[PDB]
Amino acid sequence: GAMNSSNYAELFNNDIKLFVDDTNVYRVTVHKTFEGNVATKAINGCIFTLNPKTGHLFLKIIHTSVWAGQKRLSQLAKWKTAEEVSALVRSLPKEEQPKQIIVTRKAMLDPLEVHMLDFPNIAIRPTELRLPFSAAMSIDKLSDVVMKATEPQMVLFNIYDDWLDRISSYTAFSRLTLLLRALKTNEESAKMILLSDPTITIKSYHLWPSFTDEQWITIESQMRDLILTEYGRKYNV
Amino acid sequence: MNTVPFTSAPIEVTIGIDQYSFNVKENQPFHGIKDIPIGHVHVIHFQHADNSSMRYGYWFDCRMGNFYIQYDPKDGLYKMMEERDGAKFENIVHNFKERQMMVSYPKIDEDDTWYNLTEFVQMDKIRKIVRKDENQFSYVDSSMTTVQENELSDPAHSLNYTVINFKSREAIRPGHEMEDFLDKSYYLNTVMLQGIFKNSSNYFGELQFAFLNAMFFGNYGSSLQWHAMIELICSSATVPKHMLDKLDEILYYQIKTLPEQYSDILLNERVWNICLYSSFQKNSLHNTEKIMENKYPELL
Numbered sequence: 001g002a003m004n005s006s007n008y009a010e011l012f013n014n015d016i017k018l019f020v021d022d023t024n025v026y027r028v029t030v031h032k033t034f035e036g037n038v039a040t041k042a043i044n045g046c047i048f049t050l051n052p053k054t055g056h057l058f059l060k061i062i063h064t065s066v067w068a069g070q071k072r073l074s075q076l077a078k079w080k081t082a083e084e085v086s087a088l089v090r091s092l093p094k095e096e097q098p099k100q101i102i103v104t105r106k107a108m109l110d111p112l113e114v115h116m117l118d119f120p121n122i123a124i125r126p127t128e129l130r131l132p133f134s135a136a137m138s139i140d141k142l143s144d145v146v147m148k149a150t151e152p153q154m155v156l157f158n159i160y161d162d163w164l165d166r167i168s169s170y171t172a173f174s175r176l177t178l179l180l181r182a183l184k185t186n187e188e189s190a191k192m193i194l195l196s197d198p199t200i201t202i203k204s205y206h207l208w209p210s211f212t213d214e215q216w217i218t219i220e221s222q223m224r225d226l227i228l229t230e231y232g233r234k235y236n237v
Numbered sequence: 238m239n240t241v242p243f244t245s246a247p248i249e250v251t252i253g254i255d256q257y258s259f260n261v262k263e264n265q266p267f268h269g270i271k272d273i274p275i276g277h278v279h280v281i282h283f284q285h286a287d288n289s290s291m292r293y294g295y296w297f298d299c300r301m302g303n304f305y306i307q308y309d310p311k312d313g314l315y316k317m318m319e320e321r322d323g324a325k326f327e328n329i330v331h332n333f334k335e336r337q338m339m340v341s342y343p344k345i346d347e348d349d350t351w352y353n354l355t356e357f358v359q360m361d362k363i364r365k366i367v368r369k370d371e372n373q374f375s376y377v378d379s380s381m382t383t384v385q386e387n388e389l390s391d392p393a394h395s396l397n398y399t400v401i402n403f404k405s406r407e408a409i410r411p412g413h414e415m416e417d418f419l420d421k422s423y424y425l426n427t428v429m430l431q432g433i434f435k436n437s438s439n440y441f442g443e444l445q446f447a448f449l450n451a452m453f454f455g456n457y458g459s460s461l462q463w464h465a466m467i468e469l470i471c472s473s474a475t476v477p478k479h480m481l482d483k484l485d486e487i488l489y490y491q492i493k494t495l496p497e498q499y500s501d502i503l504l505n506e507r508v509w510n511i512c513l514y515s516s517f518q519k520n521s522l523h524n525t526e527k528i529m530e531n532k533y534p535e536l537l
């Protein structure tokens with residue numbers, strides 16, 4: 001059924017699973033028209049499909065041409081997402097196909113179930129976790145490839161860089177969710193924390209800086225403080 | 238006008254005949270029901286006074302044979318049987334009528350209720366949903382499950398309604414995943430009407446039969462089936478105009494007939510609110526929407 005804090009270690013077992021977040025698929029800027037009405041302009045988006053055990057991220061870039069001449073785009077976006085995830089699953093060798101797909105928003109359940117009727121053994125599940133995957137577009141290299149795309153495109157990343165050489169996937173997922181929650185709550189500050197020190201760089205083949213174990217503990221502490229700080233600023237505590 | 242005689246009434250029982258019902262006391266001199274209108278299916282149903290558990294009954298059509306009811310003390314129920322000896326049957330009925338031991342089917346002349354509930358219901362189609370080929374009549378009770386219910390357990394005692402499932406490969410074409418799930422017209426018109434039912438009359442017949450089993454037996458799987466067949470129509474953007482008009486009439490008489498005190502269990506709030514207020518056909522069921530709003534405004 002639904003995924004929550006009780007069955008949290010299930011994410012890191014040896015059953016292949018993917019998270020699917022559709023929150024950046026249909027993206028718009030709202031603006032005024034010459035006549036003083038309001039209109040939207042779509043910008044490029046992405047599906048965020050992540051294996052939490054391996055860090056493998058299948059970033060399907062959604063080019064603005066897919067909505068050309070289409071109505072009810074928000075409803076369309078969940079189906080576009082469903083269609084792309086289904087196409088991705090079918091593209092994978094059988095032994096790499098997921099056993100479970102966890103959607104971060106319950107409105108994805110029916111579209112994905114419908115797309116996955118051919119795969120009755122693949123469980124489609126919601127989650128009671130509030131996962132900060134919407135903040136994926138705050139990762140500079142991911143935002144860059146989405147905005148530069150001139151056509152539909154799939155880009156593969158490991159969202160954990162090389163962390164799994166030193167930490168478990170539970171710890172790597174916890175680090176990722178803390179970083180993304182911080183970027184979601186105060187992007188400017190979080191980025192400042194991540195790059196304040198010019199001697200720690202991001203390798204060309206990585207997303208995040210090359211922190212040592214000790215430095216990661218410092219960074220993680222600073223991100224918690226940021227989240228707590230914003231929580232206070234928000235609620236006046 | 239035809240007759241269903243009873244051998245006797247050895248146990249106290251409420252007897253239903255179509256939408257009518259009456260009480261028979263233990264060992265009361267009751268020998269059946271006369272003046273049954275020819276031309277329609279009928280249902281004679283039973284609820285024992287000492288065990289309201291298990292409503293049960295028999296669908297039959299007097300044009301297909303001479304039927305009577307006899308209590309079986311071993312199996313503990315009123316059973317329908319066929320009498321093959323026509324002369325014997327006529328003589329039995331004539332005697333019971335002369336002794337005025339029968340209740341008269343109490344049809345008001347103005348009253349088209351039963352016709353309107355059974356307009357498309359045929360015995361031949363009943364006998365394919367209820368499989369017991371050695372009999373010309375069909376037994377149904379409160380507890381019988383449907384073929385779909387069993388897939389989600391005795392197959393011989395099942396209700397073989399047409400399986401409707403909106404998230405099934407049958408309902409959803411390769412490349413029209415969104416179109417077929419948000420607009421069920423393909424599934425209604427090509428798969429069900431053209432493919433399985435052949436015409437809307439057979440579809441409405443199953444719909445009406447499902448409602449009647451839900452109402453008269455409290456049969457839960459029948460209620461599920463009735464609501465599924467309504468929803469499939471209401472959720473199709475493309476439905477023949479004559480079907481929508483006929484559906485409105487069918488549902489009107491079903492809602493009109495439903496016992497007020499059984500509305501809570503026989504009517505699915507989600508389906509009805511969706512069908513009347515959100516679906517493609519939300520504005521096509523004028524009569525049904527008006528009786529629902531005046532009779533069950535709570536449900537909505």
Ligand SMILES: N[C@H](CC(=O)O)Cc1ccccc1F
Pocket residue numbers: 066070076079080081083412413414415416417
């Ligand atoms: N081609 C899809 C056909 C369908 O399943 O009904 C509909 C669709 C989904 C997503 C983006 C665009 C689009 F046209």
